[PDB]
Every structure is written in C-alpha cells, then in structure tokens.
Design a protein around this nucleic acid. Structure first.
Ligand SMILES: [Mg+2]
Ligand SMILES: [Mg+2]
Ligand SMILES: [Mg+2]
Ligand SMILES: [Mg+2]
Ligand SMILES: [Mg+2]
Ligand SMILES: [Mg+2]
Ligand SMILES: [Mg+2]
Ligand SMILES: [Mg+2]
Ligand SMILES: [Mg+2]
Ligand SMILES: [Mg+2]
Ligand SMILES: [Mg+2]
Ligand SMILES: [Mg+2]
Ligand SMILES: [Mg+2]
Ligand SMILES: [Mg+2]
Ligand SMILES: [Mg+2]
Ligand SMILES: [Mg+2]
Ligand SMILES: [Mg+2]
Ligand SMILES: [Mg+2]
Ligand SMILES: [Mg+2]
Lengths: 114, 127, 101, 151, 82, 98, 206
RNA sequence: GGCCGGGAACUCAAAGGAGACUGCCAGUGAUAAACUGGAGGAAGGUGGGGAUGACGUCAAGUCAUCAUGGCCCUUACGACCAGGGCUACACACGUGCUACAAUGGCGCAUACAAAGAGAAGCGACCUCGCGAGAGCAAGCGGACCUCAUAAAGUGCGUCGUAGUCCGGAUUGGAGUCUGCAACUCGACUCCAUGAAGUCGGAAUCGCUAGUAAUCGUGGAUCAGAAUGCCACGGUGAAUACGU
RNA sequence: AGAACCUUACCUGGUCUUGACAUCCACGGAAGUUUUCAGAGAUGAGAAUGUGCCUUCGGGAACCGUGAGACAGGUGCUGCAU
C-alpha cells in the first residue's frame, strides 16, 4: 500500500483509497483501477502485491504527488515573476479569477485581520 | 355495464370505471402495487372499498394523469367514491360520513409579489 | 434619455442593418470547419473587426420607444415598464388588462 | 388565537398498523415533508422494538409513551411584575404530543448509526424509564413540583 | 477563453504596427490601446506602451508572456493598502 | 378540410366571429366540425409601478389570446368564396390553411 | 398615488379599449408605437377641436381612426379637407391606408377628457381655480350625472406651497367595477409650473 | 404502441349557465340584528386565493423614466471616439445560496407534474466529442414541433460517524461558444486541488394548511451573463390551552 | 427585468463647435454603393460609379455637404417650487 511514494490507506475501497494520491481524484482513480482490471469496491488490504504492482505503474502514467505539485507551484511561480494581473493577485493573496473583494474573498485572504 | 366516476385532487384527474368482478385493480395499465409504491397511497385508493366492504365484489379500471403520488391517489379514491354512488346511490351516506364524497379543494396557493413563497416573507430587519 | 443617447441608438441600428450581410458571411467563414483554410479564416477575423463597431447587433441597447429608457424594457411592447403601465391603464394596449388568478 | 377557535385537522392513520396515534408520531418525526422517509424510519424502529421487547408494535409504543407522558407543566404567567412558573395540568391530547416530541428530540440527540436505531434505542429506554425523554419528563415534573405553590 | 477554432485575436492595426516594427528593427515603444490583443511570438523583444486607462505603461515583451493579452501587463487600478 | 384559426384578445368578439363564420357555412357549405375552443394563451407581465425603488410595488397584467378552430370539411367550392371576402371584425386574426 | 386607475381597472368589465386590433409579438411593438404617433399628432393638430378619445383599429393592413369630438364640424371642416389631410398624414405615419371616422360627443360637459381640458385651458388663461372647478362640477350635474369629482393639484394661484383641492358632488363609487366611471387627466402649464387636473364622472352602473 | 379504423363516452379545452343565499331545521337572542349547532350539499357560511387601498400623514421617494416653473453652462455643464472604471478592498452590516451530513451521498435502475416560451427563434433525430458542446438537419409562429429526460420519491448496493466517499470554496492546467474583443471583467465543461465549516454569542426573522419546510420546473431582462426577481407544480407538517 | 465594448450618466487623453439630435434655412449636389491610405478611433484625405426626382417639366423633393443665425443640447441644481 505504497503507491506513488505515499502510503495509501488500507481498509477502504480501492477507488476511495487511491484518491489519497495527490493528483488522483475519483475520475483518475476509477480510470486507473479499470485499466488495472481491479474492481472498484475491493479493499486495498485484500489486494496482492501483483495487483498492487500493476497499480504502481498504472498511476505512473499520471503526474502525481511531488512532480505534479512542483509544476503547479512552477505554474503559479511562473505568473508571479511574469508580472501579469494573475501574478499580482497571487502576490497579494487576493482572488485570482475575478471574484469580488469588497466582501467574501476570505479563502484567499484568511480570517478578518482586525 | 360500467359505473363511472371522476376524481380530482390537487391537479390530478382520475377516471374510475367499476364493474362487478372478483376484485382486481388496474390503474394506468398497471396493478395497484406496480403504480403506487407508496404504502399510504395503497390505503387511499382502497379506503372507499374497505369502507363499503366491497373490495372483492368490484373490478376497478382506473386512468389518472397530473399531479403526483398523493395527488393521483387522492383523485383515484375520489373517483372511486363517485363511481361507488353511481353503482349504488344508497351508499352515499356512509361515504359522506367517511369524508370521501367531498372534493378536496386545497390547491397550491400562488406565489405573491414581494413574497418568496405563497406566504413566506423575506427576512425583516428593523434597522 | 438624452437626445444624443437616442441618436446613438438610431445610428447603431442603421449601421447594424447596413453591414448585416457582410458580417453574416464573415462570421460564416470563421465558424466553418470544413471549408476553413487557416489563412482564409485569419483574414475573416481581421476583416470582421475593420467594420464599424456599431454594426454589431450586440452594441444595440433597446430602449423605451417613447422615452429612450435603457432599463425595465419589454420586448413585446417596445416600451419601458413605466410607459407600459400608463398606456395599459389608458386602454391603449389591446387586450392588456390587470391580471389576477 | 384571540377570537377564532380551531376545529382540529384530521389525520389519516398509518398504513401498516392503522393507528391514529402512530400517524401523528410519523408527523412529529417527519422532516422537510419527507413523510415516506419518516414512515420507513418509525416502521423499522417499531419492529426492532417489537422483537427486542416481546409485545406488538402498538403495545411497545404505548409503554414508552406512558413513561414519557407528562401530567403537569409550568407556564410563565404574570400578575403585576411577578413572572412565576405556574403548574397546570396537561390536557390528554397535549400529553401525547409532548411525549412524541420529547422522544423524537431525544432520539435525534443520542448518536447511533441510523435514526431508526436511534428511535428504537430511545423508545426501548423509555419503556424501562432510562431515556433522555424520560429524563426531560422528570425535569418537567420536578420543575412543576417546585412551583406547586402557585395555582 | 477564446475558442481554438477562431485562432488568437489580435486587433488588425496593432498587428500591422508590429509588422513594420520588427521589419524595420525599430525599438521605440509601440503606443497601443489594444489591451485585448494576444501576444504574438512575432512581438517578442518589442516594447509596447499599453494603455491602462490613464497612461501607456511600457511592457517589454518576452518569450514567456506569449499566450497572454497586452492588458494583463498593465494593471488599471492603483491600490496600496488602506 | 380547410381550417380557419381565429385568434383575438376578446372572447366575446371571437365568439361572434365564429358564430357568423359557421353560419356563413351551413348555407353555402354544410357539415362544419364546430368551433373548437383550443387552449387560450395567458401571457402575463409584471412591471414595477413606482418610478423609483419600490420593488414590492408591482402591477401584474395579462393578455388572453383566445383561439378558435372551426375545421370546415366537405367544401362546396362555392362556400370558399363565402368563407373568403368576409371582413367581419377588426381585432380578430384569421388564418387560412389548405 | 394610491388609487388604481379608474379606466384601467374597468377595462374588461365596463370600459372598452381605445386600441382594438390584433397582432403577434413580431409587429405588436410597431403597431403600439405607430398608435402612439398617430394619437400624438392628432391631439396636437386637434387641440382646439375638443377631442375626447382617439380610437384606433387595424383591420387587414389598414388603420381605422375614430376621433370622438364635441366639434365634428371644426374637425371635418369645409367639405372634409381637414379630415382628408388628416387621413393622408395619418396614413403616411402609420404606413398603411387610413380611414378617419368622426364620432360626435353629444355633451362635452359629461366627458372627463373635455372637462379636464376645459379646466386646464381656464387655468392657463388665469381663471381662478375654484371657479373653474365649481363651474365644471355644476355643469356636469345639471346635464345629468350621478356624480362628478374634480381634483386640481399644483401651485394653485401661484402659491409657493403646492396643494390639492377637490370637489365632489353626487356619487362617485370608485371601488364599484360595475360603475361606469369616466376618468381622465390634464396638465395646465402655468407660469408657476404644472397644475394637474383629474376628473371623475359617474354615469350610473351596468 | 390512440398505433389504425373508428367513437363523442370520459379526461381535457373554452364559451355559456346552474350552484351557496343564513336558503332550511333546532336552540339562544329584546318578540331584532345576529350567534351557536344540524341536515343537505362539491363547497356553509366574507368556501380558498387575488385585484380592489377612504379623508389624510410622513415638505416620505422620484427634476436620472417622463413632463415641468425657476436658476445654471452655451469653442461647454453640450457632442463624437478609443481605453479605464461602475467588478477596487485593512474592514462593518443587510438580503440570499451552499453546507457542516446517515431523515444522508455515491452508483445503478425506475415512477408521478404543472405552468410557460419560441422565426436573424425554439431547434427533434442521427454522427462526432469524457464533457461543455459541435456538425448535419426535420418539425414548429405551435393542445401538433422544440425547449423537455422533473426532482425530491422508490428499489437494490456502498460508506460506518470520519473534517469522512460530508462540504466544494480556492487555485493550477486543457477547453467550449456568445460576441468586433472574455486582461481588468462570464457562463459553462473536463482533469487535478479539497479551504472554512462538525449546527453558530448577545440578539433576531418568517409562517395557522396544501401554509411552513423541502424538491424540482420556466421566463422577463437578455448576443452571453441568476444563488436575484416573477410564476409553476411535487411531497407535505407542528401548534394555536388562551389573552 | 441582467455594467466586457454598448449600456454609461464616471475619468484619462484624442477631438467638434448651429453642433449628434430638430425646423426654417441659402447655395452646391442624387444618396448611396464599392474601395485605399493615415489614425486607436473619432476623423481626415482620397479613388471610383451612381445621376435615380416625378414632372405646369424650367422645378417642390428625400435627402447629402458647406456657410450665415435664430436656435438646438444638458442623466446640470432645486422632489423644500411642481
Ligand atoms: Mg487525490
Ligand atoms: Mg407546493
Ligand atoms: Mg426583495
Ligand atoms: Mg446588451
Ligand atoms: Mg429613445
Ligand atoms: Mg371591496
Ligand atoms: Mg424630502
Ligand atoms: Mg433625496
Ligand atoms: Mg469597462
Ligand atoms: Mg453596482
Ligand atoms: Mg405557446
Ligand atoms: Mg472530500
Ligand atoms: Mg394570518
Ligand atoms: Mg466607452
Ligand atoms: Mg462601459
Ligand atoms: Mg464618458
Ligand atoms: Mg450636464
Ligand atoms: Mg416630497
Ligand atoms: Mg411628488
């Protein structure tokens, strides 16, 4: 139970356990499982090392965990030194996709400062 | 021949034909249990027949459209009551005492201007 | 509305039906996928923007025909809500009476 | 209200057991108009109550209600600037209404896997007078006993 | 954003303004009002004075800022804290 | 056979229109299918009555478009000119099909 | 501003419409706009012709205008040139061949529009407003009316503080839809601004 | 298979009528008005819901719908244009939406509506695309065609009470199409991400039955852009001792 | 009852002053169609080809452009004048 350099949980259905890989949601998880010919509902614990091993290289077709988390950080860093509008929004911790800042925007700005 | 009744309830219109029979009920070319999954819908269309203890003496052929499960069931039971009095006028007194003869005129109150629903007002702030 | 605002709307309608045919076929070239040469589509979008901006139907803000009001407009009557109500109360809109249900 | 005196709305009895009282309890437990969802919950809970008690669904339900039905309640009333709680005898119809409401709120609070399990568990504890609904009825009787000096 | 089938949008006058700019090798800033034109690989190296509402902010086009629009490099609202 | 669809904003006007048109028939051409009522369109409108900032102050109007279909079958080919050439009432729209 | 328009509330019950034609949404707005233009022009030309209501009909690609007036002779003129020139210009602004019928109002003192217009002209001629209102009320009551209400609002007599004076003689039931209430308004453009005149004339029920 | 022939029964449609009026009975009441019950009846008493808002009040709102007195500008306080902004953001309130879950949510299957809108419009079917959508293309100015497969519901599995298979805000890619143009500054889709939040202090709001609560539906505005507004149905409560 | 432009009334800089919208005007001229250069666009400069009125005809137009002016224009203020 060590796909993609992390310990995916046991005792959970393979679809649910597989999504713990950073870069694998439910769509990729069921695509990986179907490509590996493993039923969705089976627990990770009941899998055999052969079944786990075909999982290992099945998710190797997807950029996941560290390398994907590098490119997203590369893509944000990309904007930030570019000096574009999106970069400046990333600099200031403000909403990037044109949401209002007069109210709300708490996810980007955190809790109210005063 | 057939003794017909029309039943209406909450935007539903039922068409009830009764015949002297061994007891069998088809609504919209379906049996009672095929059509009405709801258990309380089961009773409602049975309520007239059980009251007049005529459940097995009659065969019911019913069509209904409009409304929902409870609307159609109540309309069906109202149509059975109408046809039951068509079958035997004397039964009206017991059916009326049970409350089945009256057409249930409760309808969805319209939405009003300035109101979120028929009566629900927007939240009111003093200041 | 100001007289100039009404004049802007009149000119926009005049431009939009003057260039309606040319804009229609230009948008056909860009939209087409099969008979779509990469260069051929490219000149079309370059040509489309050389036409006056007011020839685009989207630049038309329909206004109350009597006042020129740009808000509360009704397509059926060509009037704003204010002019519709007073023409309705005067009985000058056929078949239009106060509703209740 | 001030003038208009209400004729009671009539409730059609429950299908499985044909009980006027039980149909009201489904209404108490109904949320968001989902009477079908509520009907299954109390029908499931009632049959585990039957199996785990020994009597029928109605008898088991009646036993739990009896241990939760209040007899006297307080009401904050006024003479001058008084604000005392005044003990008043509960009318029989309100006794069942209060018992059903107290059972349902207690069942919601006591965390289990399912609401039917929650309802069955609380209904059973009510039968042996250990439930939180029984606790609340004790508090009401205790609160109305303290203020028995007013009438 | 803009459909792939319709290509990139660059307004015609600016497109032919940088045409002669790169053709002549001129390095003077290109004063434009088209904040909505996408950057072309052609314009890499040029300096474009992009309007922001009040001023033409000079942006030195680099290879990295190619798939973007001129306006993204000329913020229109000035804000420095409250 | 040939269908006449009548639509007007006034139901009394449309009833008068249908009454005369089917009695234009039954003399020059008989066997009329009768004026079928057809559902009436209730086009409703809701406008702000105040010039300024009274959102809950609204007038609700409606235009009832009454429809009628006669469906005159078995035409005598001298009922067609009787059905035609009639200019009965303004405010009634007459549609001739087939 | 809390009374429903007396005409509009009765539009289907007792009062008729002033525009009686049919159109689909494609030409409804155009017909409505042209109706406004012909009414606007006609009132402007027949200002001194005592016109009460202008009825518009649009049968089969043609406009039929019925002008209700208390001065049909002045509207028609010598051999009908004025109605004929009206017919020409009504046709060329409505876009369709025109036909101008003329309805004669038997008693101009019983029509709300003409009563309101007469008061408005008096106020613009600096007649003292209470006298104008009393004369209108008395005239209607004596030619036969179950009631009349006249309301005048604005800077009355040039008063710096606008006020509303109204006289009601007889019976004017506005909540009775069966009641036939002739109602109309007019505005006097005095040297001190606009004075609003409202006239209700009750002519029995049914 | 209303699919066909047919039929005019029924539903339904929309016109015209009937019906409900304290009409009848009993009691109370000043022998009155009226009230309380009952019968009958679909409906019992102003059956339900609308529209309908008296004289006036707040110098309440609107000179920015419009009109208008009086002032004020008249190579500008007018007029045209491109670009910005009205969308900012240490904060504070109002009104909402979505949730904090198991009366759930995820999958599969399967029922039952109403009311609307459509001609540069609604746009079947079929093909392509994971999808948003693209082609091609009927039909329909409409009880015909299209929008358009209602969703809660039900049945069977799964989860196992955990910030979780709850929640879906952010934020990265990649895309669609609407329009000259999606950067400021849209809607939608797909993959990835999976925040706050475990029911909310003082305080406070709405609702007396098809009501509240909950579930969907569509349309005005509108090239495009609703969690708002205006309508429509589906399931459907609790309680009113009393002042 | 729906701010990307438009809306839009705001402001930055580009512009015009009988004006964008009217009516009388006085002259010249089909207008209205297709293009090019410059401009960010406004706009300016051009290139063509259009010569239709409908007809007491010669000439009213239906309009297009300059030039005088009356004037137009104002979502400018006062809702405590209406
Ligand atoms: Mg993951
Ligand atoms: Mg409802
Ligand atoms: Mg509101
Ligand atoms: Mg628009
Ligand atoms: Mg206008
Ligand atoms: Mg009344
Ligand atoms: Mg004030
Ligand atoms: Mg103010
Ligand atoms: Mg902007
Ligand atoms: Mg705003
Ligand atoms: Mg329709
Ligand atoms: Mg999650
Ligand atoms: Mg109430
Ligand atoms: Mg602008
Ligand atoms: Mg703008
Ligand atoms: Mg401006
Ligand atoms: Mg100004
Ligand atoms: Mg005031
Ligand atoms: Mg006022």
């Amino acid at each position: 139970a060590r796909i993609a350099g992390i310990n995916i949980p046991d005792h959970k259905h393979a679809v649910i356990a597989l999504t713990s890989i950073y870069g694998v949601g439910k769509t990729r998880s069921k695509a990986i499982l179907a490509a590996a010919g493993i039923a969705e509902d089976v627990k990770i614990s009941e899998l055999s090392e052969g079944q786990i091993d075909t999982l290992r290289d099945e998710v190797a077709k997807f950029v996941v965990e560290g390398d994907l988390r590098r490119e997203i950080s590369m893509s944000i860093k990309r904007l930030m030194d570019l000096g574009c509008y999106r970069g400046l929004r990333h600099r200031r911790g403000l909403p990037v996709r044109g949401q209002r800042t007069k109210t709300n925007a708490r996810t980007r700005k955190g809790p109210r400062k005063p | 021949n057939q003794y017909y009744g029309t039943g209406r309830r909450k935007s539903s219109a039922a068409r009830v034909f009764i015949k002297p029979g061994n007891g069998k009920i088809v609504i919209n070319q379906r049996s009672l249990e095929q059509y009405f999954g709801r258990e309380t819908a089961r009773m409602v269309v049975r309520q007239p027949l059980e009251l007049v203890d005529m459940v097995e003496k009659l065969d019911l052929y019913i069509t209904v459209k409009g409304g929902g499960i409870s609307g159609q069931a109540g309309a069906i039971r109202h149509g059975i009551t109408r046809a039951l009095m068509e079958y035997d006028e004397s039964l009206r007194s017991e059916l009326r005492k049970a409350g089945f003869v009256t057409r249930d005129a409760r309808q969805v109150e319209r939405k009003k201007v300035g109101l979120r629903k028929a009566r629900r007002r927007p939240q009111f702030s003093k200041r | 509305a100001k007289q100039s605002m009404k004049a802007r709307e009149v000119k926009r309608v005049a431009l939009a039906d003057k260039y309606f045919a040319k804009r229609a076929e230009l948008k056909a070239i860009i939209s087409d996928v099969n008979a779509a040469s990469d260069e051929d589509r490219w000149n079309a979008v370059l040509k489309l923007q050389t036409l006056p901006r007011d020839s685009s139907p989207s630049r038309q803000r329909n206004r109350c025909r009597q006042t020129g009001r740009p808000h509360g407009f009704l397509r059926k009557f060509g009037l704003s809500r204010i002019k519709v109500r007073e023409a309705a109360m005067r009985g000058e809109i056929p078949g239009l009476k106060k509703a209740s249900w | 209200p001030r003038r208009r005196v209400i004729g009671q709305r009539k409730i059609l009895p429950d299908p499985k057991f044909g009980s006027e009282l039980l149909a009201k309890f489904v209404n108490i437990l109904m949320v968001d108009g989902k009477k079908s969802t509520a009907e299954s919950i109390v029908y499931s809970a009632l049959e585990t109550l039957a199996q785990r008690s020994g009597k029928s669904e109605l008898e088991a339900f009646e036993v739990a209600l009896e241990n939760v039905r209040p007899t006297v309640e307080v009401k904050s009333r006024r003479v001058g600037g008084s604000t005392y709680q005044v003990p008043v005898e509960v009318r029989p119809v309100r006794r069942n209404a209060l018992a059903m409401r107290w059972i349902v709120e207690a069942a919601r609070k006591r965390g289990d896997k399912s609401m039917a399990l929650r309802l069955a568990n609380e209904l059973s504890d009510a039968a042996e007078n250990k439930g939180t609904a029984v606790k609340k009825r004790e508090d009401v009787h205790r609160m109305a006993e303290a203020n028995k000096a007013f009438a | 954003p803009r459909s792939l089938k319709k290509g990139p949008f660059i307004d015609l006058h600016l497109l032919k303004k940088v045409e002669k700019a790169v053709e002549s090798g001129d390095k003077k800033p290109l004063r434009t009002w088209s904040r909505r034109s996408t950057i072309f690989p052609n314009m890499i190296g040029l300096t474009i004075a992009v309007h922001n509402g009040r001023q033409h902010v000079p942006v030195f086009v680099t290879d990295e800022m190619v798939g973007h629009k001129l306006g993204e490099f000329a913020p229109t609202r000035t804000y420095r804290g409250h | 056979r040939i269908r006449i669809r009548l639509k007007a904003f006034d139901h009394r006007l449309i009833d008068q229109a249908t009454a005369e048109i089917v009695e234009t028939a039954k003399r020059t051409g008989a066997q009329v299918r009768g004026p079928i009522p057809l559902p009436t369109r209730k086009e409703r409108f809701t406008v702000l009555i105040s010039p300024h900032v009274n959102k809950d102050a609204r007038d609700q109007y409606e235009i009832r478009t009454h429809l009628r279909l006669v469906d005159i079958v078995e035409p005598t080919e001298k009922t067609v000119d009787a059905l035609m050439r009639l200019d009965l009432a303004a405010g009634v729209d007459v549609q001739i099909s087939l | 501003g809390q009374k429903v328009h007396p005409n509009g509330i009765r539009l289907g019950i007792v009062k008729p419409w002033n525009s009686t034609w049919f159109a689909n949404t494609k030409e409804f707005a155009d017909n409505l706009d042209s109706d406004f233009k012909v009414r606007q022009y006609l009132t402007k030309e027949l200002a001194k012709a005592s016109v009460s209501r202008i009825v518009i009909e649009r049968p089969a690609k043609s406009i039929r205008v019925t002008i209700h007036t208390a001065r049909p002779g002045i509207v028609i003129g010598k051999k009908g040139e004025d109605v004929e020139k009206l017919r020409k210009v009504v046709a060329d602004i409505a876009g369709v061949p025109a036909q101008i019928n003329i309805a004669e109002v038997r008693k101009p003192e019983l029509d709300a529009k003409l009563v309101a217009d007469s008061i408005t002209s008096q106020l613009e001629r600096r007649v003292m407003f209470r006298r104008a209102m009393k004369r209108a009320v008395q005239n209607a009551m004596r030619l036969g009316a179950k009631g009349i209400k006249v309301e005048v609002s604005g800077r009355l007599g040039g008063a710096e503080i606008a006020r509303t004076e109204w006289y009601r003689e007889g019976r004017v039931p506005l909540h009775t839809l069966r009641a036939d209430i002739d109602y109309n308004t007019s505005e006097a453009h005095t040297t001190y601004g606009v004075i609003g005149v409202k006239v209700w004339i009750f002519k029995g029920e049914i």
